[PDB]
């Protein structure tokens, strides 16, 4: 019967990991900076490959230079939330003290 019990413990462990994989999926979707950076890296790779035929240069060094430029240029699309929280509360009527 120990073997049958083992077939049960495998299912119990598997469903515990199924939950955790779902949690990571939510975290990945919430991560937009990572996704945009990966898309930019893919675009840079495509550009380097195109150059590999257009000019026949060292696509490896082209990739290195483009990735260095991307790392330098990161954080150019920072989200804009130039908002005054107390002012927004007052506009909603939830903040009357306005000294």
């Amino acid at each position: 019967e120990k073997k049958v019990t083992q077939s049960l413990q495998t299912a119990r462990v598997s469903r515990r990991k199924v939950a955790h994989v779902l949690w990571l999926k939510k975290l990945q979707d919430s991560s937009d900076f990572l996704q945009e950076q990966e898309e930019a890296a893919r675009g840079v790779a495509a550009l380097a490959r195109a150059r590999a035929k257009e000019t026949g240069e060292e696509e490896e060094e082209l990739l290195a230079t483009e990735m260095a430029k991307l790392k330098e240029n990161a954080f150019v699309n920072l989200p804009s939330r130039n908002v005054s929280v107390p002012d927004l509360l007052a506009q909603l009527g939830l903040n009357d003290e306005k000294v």
């Binding site: 939330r81 908002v83 929280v85 509360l89 939830l94 009357d96 003290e97």
Partner: protein, 335 residues
């Protein structure tokens, strides 16, 4: 022939709450025609009504103060998270529609309106206006005495406040009883409290700035520790005061302000139905598509589906009263 709502419900107090007694049907439907016939017949019978039907009895204290206290405690236990109130809009849940005692109120309002218009026809418009003003004054006087569990009732009947028997200040944890607001704050949203919950930490801090003890906060030991940690971290981050309660401008949770605005507008549109909030959410839906509008969209879909179902039911009734309404009793009981 101005109705009761046309005459008296434009006042502040009178116009605040206005229950609906009958479904509204657009002109040109069997329901509308039957309602017109009933209104005409009822007006004619009000003309040919006797004196005995308008007999009224003097008002008396419906409850003693101690009995009112007991009733309030029992209602609170029935709904420990919400506040006790006469939810006359949700009335249908508690009292079956066929046994609604407010049909008498509706018909009495109709009769009063008919009486006032006939009086205006007979004596004169100026006297009618005098009487309308006097009736408005009387309704304002009697507005707050209808609720037996309200303070207006006690004030109207001139009853002294109850002097409750002393109870211990230091009791066992088994008997600790928080208020509904403290209860909601402590439960949070089924999630342990974090420093990011700046909208609630003010409850557990005294006016002196000191964190309140567990006997006062009525929190579990784990909740107390979590709240202490949250307050300490918020203070170290300088988003929560050190020597007083947070200012009204510091009560935003640590989150995106636009998501907070969306949440607040959804809450308004659900609790009261602010058309301005609805319009703001509609424009934000397209202007900032990176926020979360699940609850707002779900409520919109629910309302649209209910409208479609009501239209289908009206079509079925027009074709002939179908078994939907009969089922709402028989099938519900059988289930």
């Amino acid at each position: 022939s101005p109705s009761f709502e046309q005459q008296f419900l434009n006042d502040k107090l009178l116009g605040q709450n206005t229950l609906q007694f009958t479904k509204v049907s657009e002109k040109g439907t069997a329901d509308a025609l039957f309602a017109e016939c009933l209104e005409s017949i009822r007006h004619r019978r009000f003309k040919l009504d006797p004196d005995v039907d308008n007999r009224s009895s003097e008002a008396v204290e419906k409850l003693t103060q101690e009995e009112r206290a007991i009733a309030e405690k029992i209602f609170q236990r029935v709904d420990p998270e919400r506040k006790i109130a006469p939810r006359l809009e949700s009335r249908g849940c508690y009292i079956d529609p066929l046994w609604d005692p407010f049909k008498r109120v509706e018909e009495l309002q109709q009769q009063v309106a008919q009486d006032l218009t006939e009086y205006a026809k007979l004596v004169g418009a100026a006297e009618a206006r005098r009487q309308r003003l006097l009736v408005r004054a009387s309704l304002r006087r009697q507005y707050r005495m209808h609720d037996p569990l309200s303070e207006g009732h006690r004030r109207f009947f001139g009853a002294q406040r109850a002097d409750p028997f002393p109870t211990p200040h230091r009791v066992h944890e088994r008997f600790w009883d928080p208020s509904p607001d403290v209860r909601v704050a402590l439960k949070n949203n089924n999630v342990p409290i974090s420093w990011r919950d700046l909208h609630i930490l003010h409850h557990f801090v005294g006016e002196n700035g000191l964190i309140l003890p567990r006997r006062t906060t009525h929190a579990s030991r784990y909740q107390q520790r979590c709240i202490f940690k949250a307050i300490c971290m918020a203070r170290r981050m300088a988003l929560f005061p050190y020597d007083w309660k947070p200012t009204q401008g510091e009560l935003m949770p640590v989150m995106d302000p636009l998501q907070y605005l969306v949440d607040e507008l959804t809450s308004r549109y659900k609790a009261t139905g602010d058309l301005r909030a609805d319009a703001m959410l509609c424009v934000m839906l397209s202007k900032y598509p990176k926020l979360n509008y699940f609850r707002y969209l779900q409520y919109k879909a629910q309302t649209q589906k209910s409208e479609v179902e009501a239209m289908q039911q009206q079509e079925e009734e027009d074709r002939g009263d179908f078994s939907r309404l009969l089922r709402k009793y028989k099938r519900a009981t059988t289930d």
